[PDB]
Amino acid sequence: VQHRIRITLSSKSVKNLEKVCSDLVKGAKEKQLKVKGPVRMPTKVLNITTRKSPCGEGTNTWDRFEMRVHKRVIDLVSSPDVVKQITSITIEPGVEVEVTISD
């Protein structure tokens, strides 16, 4: 339509995020809106390494915890109305959808 819409999607899981992204790009391609995406940002790897022992005895053994944040960007050209009409389907838990209107 007129404006430029960037939908940022973030999640801790790949399958939920990818199927939400597939729903968005499928809805965009049904309403004949041009869609640039999904564009996969580099995955963020939040890492915590701590001594497993609750005290200071034993072999100093380390567990490495990881949280992986996956970011997806979808770039449509349209009006806000169709954008909130598309991003109103059941977004699965953990997926953070974020809509921003550009020029």
Task: List contacts with other proteins (CB under 8 A).
Answer: 10, 12, 44, 46, 48, 50-52, 54, 63-67, 69, 71, 93, 96
Q: Min. distance of Cβ 26 from other proteins in angstroms?
A: 20
Q: Which is nearer to other proteins, 25 or 95 (CB)?
A: 95
49 residue type, one letter: T
Contact status, residue 13 vs residue 72, Cβ threshold 8 Å:
no
Contact status, residue 100 vs residue 38, Cβ threshold 8 Å:
no
Q: Which is nearer to other proteins, 32 or 64 (CB)?
A: 64
Interatomic CA distance for residues 27 and 6, integer angstroms: 15
Q: 62 has which bridge partners? A: 51
Q: Min. distance of Cβ 34 from other proteins in angstroms?
A: 25
Q: Which is nearer to other proteins, 30 or 66 (CB)?
A: 66
Contact status, residue 94 vs residue 16, Cβ threshold 8 Å:
yes
- Using alpha carbons only, give the angle 79, 85, 91 rounded to the nearest 5 degrees: 125
Q: Min. distance of Cβ 81 from other proteins in angstroms?
A: 16
Q: Which is nearer to other proteins, 9 or 76 (CB)?
A: 9
